[PDB]
Structure formats: structure tokens, C-alpha cells
């Protein structure tokens, strides 16, 4: 099985679109105002294609919250953490993710990397490999980007102790700042030609949502290399 990784495009809408869906289900985020966001990022992000030949198997890329301040479905997203974290965190907390994200001198960017479940964990590195490529190109040429203090990711977790769809999700976390879970009633199960999936032990869907410093990421890029390396 031979994957290709492109930059994003117009064809790969409908692919895009899906994996955000899965991620985001039915909360109040605009999933096709937030995929032509993604597209429109010229230089950021790639989607991967098994080279059928259409699908989108997957997908990261990277978001600056404060630089897209006037996009609808970046405020939906903030506001959408905001609100769950409000119902499942100490207001301490609350408030310290609020001041998160609304310091302009310290941007945080949104990472999105999303993939069904069939392709093999070890493309992970790559993905983010290549990111922080486009990432630090973007550091060098001054565009916002590049320019990011923090980085907020949403994960899909489960628990029957906290468990990741995307299993390197987990060095993330533990590097995490600030986090919490809260659960999700949909409960859909990825759509990567699989008709439906299966736990021996009976499973709670939620989202984790991790704000990890920028000073971290080489060494989650580090695990990343040791575990998923080919």
C-alpha cells in the first residue's frame, strides 16, 4: 500500500469535509466554512491519497485562531471549547483557557490532523514531519502560521486510563498544559470503507482537547520518531 502526500486542493473537498465531520459531528462548527478555510491556506497542509485514487485517507494541517479572527467557523471553534470547558472545568481552568486564547502577543494554532483508521499509524510521522517543515518555512518567511506560541488540538479519545484514536496523539497529551474531555453523543465510529466497528470491552466516545506549548513540540517530534519510525 503506497501513500502520496499533496497539498490541499479543490478536488479534495469532499474528503476533507468528511474527516472534519468526524471529528466535529454535529457541534455548532461550520465543517464546510472550516474545509474551504483549510484549502484557501496556501503552503500549509497536505492530504494523503493511496496512489480510490480521490479518496482522501487523510489529512493535517494548521490553523493561526488569532490571525483568522473574522473567519466564523474559527470563533465557533472557540467558542465551542469555551463552553465545554466551562461545563466540565473549574472555572480556574476556564479562565486561564480563555486568557489562552485571547493573548494576541502569543497566537495559538489549531492543529487538525485527522485519518480513517485502516491506514497504518506509522504515516503519522511523515504528516507532522512535513508540517513542521511548513511550519518553520512559514517562521522564516514571517507569516502568521509560523508564528504560533501554543498548540490546541482536538482529539477523538475513548475510555471503557485515556485512550487515542490517533495513537500518537498520546505524547501530545502528556506534554499538554492544559487539558480536559468531554463526552460526545453521536458516537460515530470512522467511515474508511468499514461498515461498523467493534470493542470486546464497552467504550465511552469523547474529545480531548490539549493546549501544548510550542517549546514541547521537538520533543513530541522526538517519540513521534522512536515509535513510529519504518
Avoid at 454535529?26 to 472550516?34: D, M, R, S, Y
Avoid at 471549547?81 to 502569543?106: A, I, Y
Wanted: glycine fraction near 4%; charged fraction near 25%.
Amino acid at each position: 500500500h503506497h501513500f502520496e502526500a499533496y497539498s490541499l486542493s479543490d478536488n479534495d473537498y469532499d474528503g476533507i469535509k468528511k474527516l472534519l465531520q468526524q471529528l466535529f459531528l454535529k457541534a455548532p462548527v461550520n465543517t464546510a466554512e472550516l474545509t474551504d478555510l483549510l484549502i484557501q491556506q496556501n503552503h500549509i497542509g497536505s492530504v494523503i491519497k493511496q496512489t480510490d485514487e480521490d479518496e482522501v485517507f487523510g489529512f493535517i494541517s494548521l490553523l493561526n485562531l488569532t490571525e483568522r479572527k473574522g473567519t466564523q467557523c474559527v470563533e465557533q471553534i472557540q467558542e465551542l471549547v469555551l463552553r465545554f470547558c466551562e461545563k466540565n472545568c473549574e472555572k480556574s481552568m476556564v479562565e486561564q483557557l480563555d486568557k489562552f486564547l485571547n493573548d494576541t502577543t502569543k497566537p495559538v494554532g489549531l492543529l487538525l490532523s485527522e485519518r480513517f483508521i485502516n491506514v497504518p499509524p506509522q504515516i503519522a510521522l511523515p504528516m507532522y514531519q512535513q508540517l513542521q517543515k511548513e511550519l518553520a518555512g512559514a517562521h522564516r518567511t514571517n507569516k502568521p502560521c509560523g508564528k504560533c506560541y501554543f498548540y490546541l488540538l482536538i482529539s477523538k479519545t475513548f475510555v471503557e486510563a485515556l485512550m487515542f484514536a490517533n495513537a500518537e496523539e498520546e505524547f501530545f497529551y502528556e506534554k499538554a498544559i492544559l487539558k480536559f474531555n468531554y463526552s460526545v453523543q453521536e458516537e460515530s465510529d470512522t467511515c474508511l470503507g468499514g461498515k461498523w466497528s467493534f470493542d470486546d470491552v464497552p467504550m465511552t466516545p469523547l474529545r480531548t482537547v490539549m493546549l501544548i506549548p510550542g517549546d514541547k513540540m521537538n520533543e513530541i517530534m522526538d517519540k513521534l520518531k522512536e515509535y513510529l519510525s519504518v
